[PDB]
Design a binder for this molecule. Structure first.
Ligand SMILES: *[C@@H]1O[C@H](CO)[C@@H](O[C@@H]2O[C@H](CO)[C@@H](O)[C@H](O)[C@H]2NC(C)=O)[C@H](O)[C@H]1NC(C)=O
Ligand SMILES: *[C@@H]1O[C@H](CO)[C@@H](O[C@@H]2O[C@H](CO)[C@@H](O)[C@H](O)[C@H]2NC(C)=O)[C@H](O)[C@H]1NC(C)=O
Ligand SMILES: *[C@@H]1O[C@H](CO)[C@@H](O)[C@H](O)[C@H]1NC(C)=O
Lengths: 97, 49
């Protein structure tokens, strides 16, 4: 109720995967993924870290992820609802296409 | 007492870490280490033979 978690800082690190966690929502293209939280052979990982005002560090858990290359499944920043076919176009000043 | 270990040769190998075990005593600089002997996610290893 009262946030006793105001001092504890829990966050993700960067593991051995050849991409980042906060940039999967950009337009990255895969073939299949199947995330999991228990050990599966042939899978990289993102560790999970906990600390108290950034004095001492410890490792708590992980996030396990597989993939394969393709051009079928695509990440999206946010779920626009109502549109039958997703596209966007911004004219006349500088964008990131 | 009597060294029956005169024939057995136990030693370390070189694992997947980007440095060596016998050269940590040279002037190598880090930020934190925390050695351990049980499995921790996100850690390289030196095997024992
Ligand atoms: C410090 O103490 C206060 C009161 O003694 C705690 O406030 C309530 O604690 C109970 C039991 O822990 C919770 O069920 C309530 O939800 C708390 N109130 C609110 C508004 O959240 C407070 O949580 C304590 N701080 C801790 C435990 O870190
Ligand atoms: C071979 O045998 C000798 C004697 O039978 C062992 O010498 C002693 O063995 C006892 C029991 O194993 C130990 O408590 C003593 O410490 C030994 N003596 C010394 C001076 O160490 C010897 O250890 C045996 N070799 C082995 C088991 O490899
Ligand atoms: C430039 O792009 C922004 C998008 O934030 C838009 O608001 C603005 O009208 C555009 N044109 C100019 C001249 O700033």
């Amino acid at each position: 109720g009262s946030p006793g978690d105001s001092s504890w800082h829990i966050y993700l690190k960067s593991g051995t995967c050849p991409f980042s966690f906060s940039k999967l929502n950009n337009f990255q293209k895969f073939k299949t993924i199947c995330f999991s939280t228990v050990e599966v052979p042939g899978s990289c990982n993102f560790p999970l870290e906990a600390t108290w005002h950034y004095t001492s560090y410890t490792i708590v858990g992980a996030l396990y992820v597989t993939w394969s290359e393709g051009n079928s499944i695509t990440g999206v920043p946010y779920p626009v609802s109502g549109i039958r076919e997703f596209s966007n176009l911004v004219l006349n000043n500088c964008t990131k296409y």
